[PDB]
RNA sequence: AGGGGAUCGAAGAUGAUCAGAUACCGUCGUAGUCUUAACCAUAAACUAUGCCGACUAGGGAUCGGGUGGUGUUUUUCUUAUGACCCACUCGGCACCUUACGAGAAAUCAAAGUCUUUGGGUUCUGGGGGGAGUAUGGUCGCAAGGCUGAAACUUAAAGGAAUUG
C-alpha cells in the first residue's frame, strides 16, 4: 500500500530526469507535495507545474528544467534541535556552498538557510542538490 | 528562417508518387515515429509527403554548411544504392564507399582506405550497421534515408523513405544532389526541371 | 527495497533486541560474556604464571 | 556447476510437479516435459520390395496402411544417436528445428 | 597439387595492374616482358610469374575479375554506366495513363498540395 | 567558477546539450555538432553563418536525436508543420 | 623526426591551438603521441608497479610484464596508462605513451569561501571499477592528502592540496584502485552547479575554421 | 489395525560374469504399491530468487472476459446466436531484442531506481572443521522431528571465469 504519498512523488521525478524527460505525472497528490514543490520552484530547480482537479483527490503534472540531480526523502521524520542541523546538512548535501534540506516546522515548510534566520526547527521531510 | 519560396514544387509531387515513395513503409512499426498519414487496408501504411521534402532541404542545409567539399562521405552496401552513390560523388565533391565498409576506417590510421570525415550519408541502417555504429567513436554526424522498419541507433536527421526496392533510392539521391547544388553551386534559378535525369540513378540490368 | 530491518519511528525495541541475538555470533564477544578464559585456558585468564 | 539453461527440463512453469512416463529402450521413469518426443511413421511393408507384395495380390488401388508409433526417450538414452547431438554455447539457444 | 603460391600472385597483380599494355595472350611473348621490368634472381620463380599473368589474360576476354581491374578496365566499362542504354522516352513520366494511385494516397494530396493527375483505384 | 574579485577561475566552461540541458564531457566520444546554413532570398546561402546545435552521446544512442532536432528546428524557424506538440 | 597523420596533428605543428582547452572543450580525439608533448612541457611520468603475468603453454609458460604509469603536472591535468609487453623496461616506454593520450582535466574549488586560489575538489564525487568504490570529499586548508600511498601520487600530480578519502572493497588490487579513482577525479566536470546554469553561445570549433590548412593538399 | 492382493517389486532366494561380486544383467520373490479409520511432518518441498506498493523500454504470440468494425462466412431467406478475421482494452502463464542501468562474473526488465546510500514490514547469516553431534527440555506407539553448545584443531575451505 502507498504509505508515503510524498515518497512516490519525488521517486517519479528522479526516474524521469534520469531518462532525459521534460514532464512528469504524479497521481496521488497532496498539500505537502505542493508545499514541497514551491520551495524547489523558488530556487530554480523546477519550472512550472499545474494541479489537475479530479472531483475526488488530486493529480499533478510538472515541467522539468534540466537542472535537478537528486530529489530525496527521509521517511522516519526525525526530530532536529537547531544546533544538530549541521549533522544533516553535511551528509545529505555535497559541499558547504549550496544545497537545501527541506524541513517542516511550526512557522511553515522551510529550507535550512531560511530556518537558520528565524532560529526555528522541527521535523525533516527531504532534500535537493 | 526560410526563403518563402521552397514550398514543395507541384511538378515534383508527380515524381514522388510515380516512384512509390509514399506507398509503403510495411506493417512493422518502430515507435519514434510520427512520419505517417493513416493506414491502408490489407497491411500497408502511408507516409506523409510534406514531412519528407522538408527534411531533404534540411539535410541539404547541413551539407552546404561545410567549407571543404571533399569531406562528406556517402555509404551503401546494398546493391541498389551503389549506382546512386557513385553519381552523387561525381556531381559534388564527396568521396563514396560502395559495397563493403572495411571495419576500422574512421578509426585506425594504418589502413589504406582511411577516411577522416565530418559528415556521413547512409542509405540503409540495416545493411550499413557497421558504418553508423563505428562513426560514434570520433564525433561524426549521420544522415540516413530510412523507412519505418529500421532502427535509430545514432541516427540524426532521418529522411522518411521507402526501402522496399528499386525506385525511391534513385529518386531521393537525385533530389539531394539537386538541393546541394541549388544552395551554393551551378543552378542560378530553382525553376526549370534540370536535366540530367532521375533514371541516370536506379538499378540496371545485370 | 526496505532493506529488511524495521525502519519505524517507534521501532526502538526490535532494533535493540535483534542485535543482542546477533552479537552472539562473534568469538570475542561470546568468550568475554560466557567466560571460558576463567574456566579453561590453563592459566587463570592472566599474562604470566 | 553453475546455471546451464534457463528453461532446464522445459515446460513445468506456472505449474507444480507433474506426471512421469516410461522410456522405450531402458524402461526408466522420466517427466513427460523432459521426454524427447519423436513421432516415427513407418510403412507397414518395408520399402526394400515394395512392389513384390502388390504384384501377386488381389484387388486394385490397395490401402497399404502405416503404423503411427509415438516414442519417448530418457535424455541419456537419446544421446546414443537419437534427437540430441551435443551443441556449442550459443548454438543451444536455437529452438527452431533442423530441416523443414 | 600445383597450387600457385602467394609470392607469385604478388607479382601477378602488381604487373598486370600497371602494365596492361605489353600483355597479349600467349606465353612466349609475355614471358619476355616479365624479366624486362622486374629484377628476379632465379629462372624458376621468374617463369612462374609469366604462367599466372598469362592465365588472367584468358579470363579477361570472358569478363572482369575482382581485385585485378585498373587503368583501362575502369574506363572500359564505363560510358555503359555513365551514358546508360536507357532512356528512351523520359521514362517514368505519365506515359501509361495518368497515375494509378490508391484511395488513401488520393486523399493525402488534398491536405498538402491541390490537384495532380489521378486515376484513383479502390484498393 | 568565481573568486573574490578578480577574474573567473577554471578552464573549459563546458557545452550543454540543447535538448536535455546536460553537460557534455571531454572524453564523451559520441557527442555531435549540427551546423545548419543561413538561407537568403531566392535560393543562396550566407557564407560563414550557422544555426548551431549540440547533442549529447547519451540521447543519440537512445534513439531520440531525430525527434529532438525537429523540436529545436521548428522553434528556431528552420521547419514548418512537422513536429506536433500534442500527439 | 616528426611527420604527422590526421587533421589535428597538422593543426598543432602550424601552431594555432595554444595549450590546451580548444581540444577538451569541443571533445576532439587525440590519437597521436606527439600532440601533448608539443602542448604541455611539464610531464611526470612516474611508475607504480610491475607484475609478471603468466599464460599457460603445453611445455612451459609465458612471462609478460604489465606496467602501470601515472601522468600529470601541478595545475589540473592527470592521466593513466597500462600495457603488457614481454620486455620489462620497454613496457615503461609503451605505458608513458598511452597515459599521455588519455590526459583528462580536473575541476577544483572551495572548501569554505573564496579568499584566494582554489586547492581542492568542488563537489563530493565517486567512481567504481570491479568492486572498488572511491569517495572524495573536500577538506579545509592545511589538512593534506589523506589516502593510500598509491592513490596519494595520483592526487599530487593533479595539483590538489587537501582532500579526504573513503575506499571500500578489495583495495590491494592496484589497477582497479587507481582506475576507479581516475573516474571519480574525471567526473568533476559533469556535475551541474548554480554557477554553470547560465547559458553560453555555442562556439565554432578549430576544425570548422581552419579546414583548408589541415588535410593533405 | 482392518479390508484387498492383477502387475511391478526393498529384504531374500537363484543363474552367469569376476582375481573376489552377497554389484550392475536374468528367473522368481515376502513387505509395500490400492483403499478405510488413525498416525508421522520431512525432500534438489528449487524459479536453489520473502510478501504489499510505486516508477522506468521496445516487440509480437497466447489463455480468459469486455468493447467496436455495412469485415468474412454459417444459410433456414435479412437472419439471430455461434465460429473465424482487423484494431483496442483490463488480468495471467510465459518468451524474444537491447542494455543507457546493475553485477565478482555467469547472467538479470528485475538480480534496475544504492557511497547522488532512508517507501512499509517478517525471517535467516558472520573463516573452515568438530556438528545439526553432547546435554537439557519438548513432541511422537516407534522411526525420528523442533530446539541446539563447547573444549579442542587449522590457514585456508569456497564462487565465477581464462589458458593448458
Ligand atoms: Zn531410456
Residue numbers in the entry:
A (entry chain W): 2 to 130
B (entry chain A): 2 to 207
C (entry chain X): 1 to 49
D (entry chain a): 1 to 100
E (entry chain R): 2 to 124
F (entry chain V): 1 to 87
G (entry chain C): 39 to 255
Paper quotes:
The GTPase eIF5B is responsible for the correct functioning of the second checkpoint. Molecular interactions of eIF5B with other correctly assembled components on the ribosome lead to GTP hydrolysis that allows the machinery of protein production to transition from initiation into elongation.
A final addition of eIF5B and 60S preincubated with the nonhydrolyzable GTP analog (GDPCP) effectively stalls the factor on the ribosome. The reconstruction exhibits a slightly rotated configuration of the 40S (∼3°) and contains a tRNA in hybrid p/PE configuration, where the Anti-codon Stem Loop (ASL) of the tRNA is deeply inserted in the P site of the small subunit, and it is base-paired with the AUG codon. The L1-stalk is displaced inward, stabilizing the tRNA in this hybrid configuration. Density for the 4 domains of eIF5B could be identified in the maps, with the G-domain anchored to the 60S, domain II anchored to the 40S, and the unit formed by domain III, h12, and domain IV projected toward the Peptidyl Transfer Center (PTC). Unexpectedly, eIF5B has been trapped in its active conformation, even in the absence of contacts with Met-tRNAiMet. Kluyveromyces lactis subunits and eIF5B in a slightly acidic (pH 6) buffer background were used in this work. A stacking interaction with the sugar of the 23S rRNA nucleotide 2997 aligns tyrosine 837 (S. cerevisiae numbering) toward the catalytic histidine, which is in its “active” configuration, inserted through the hydrophobic gate.
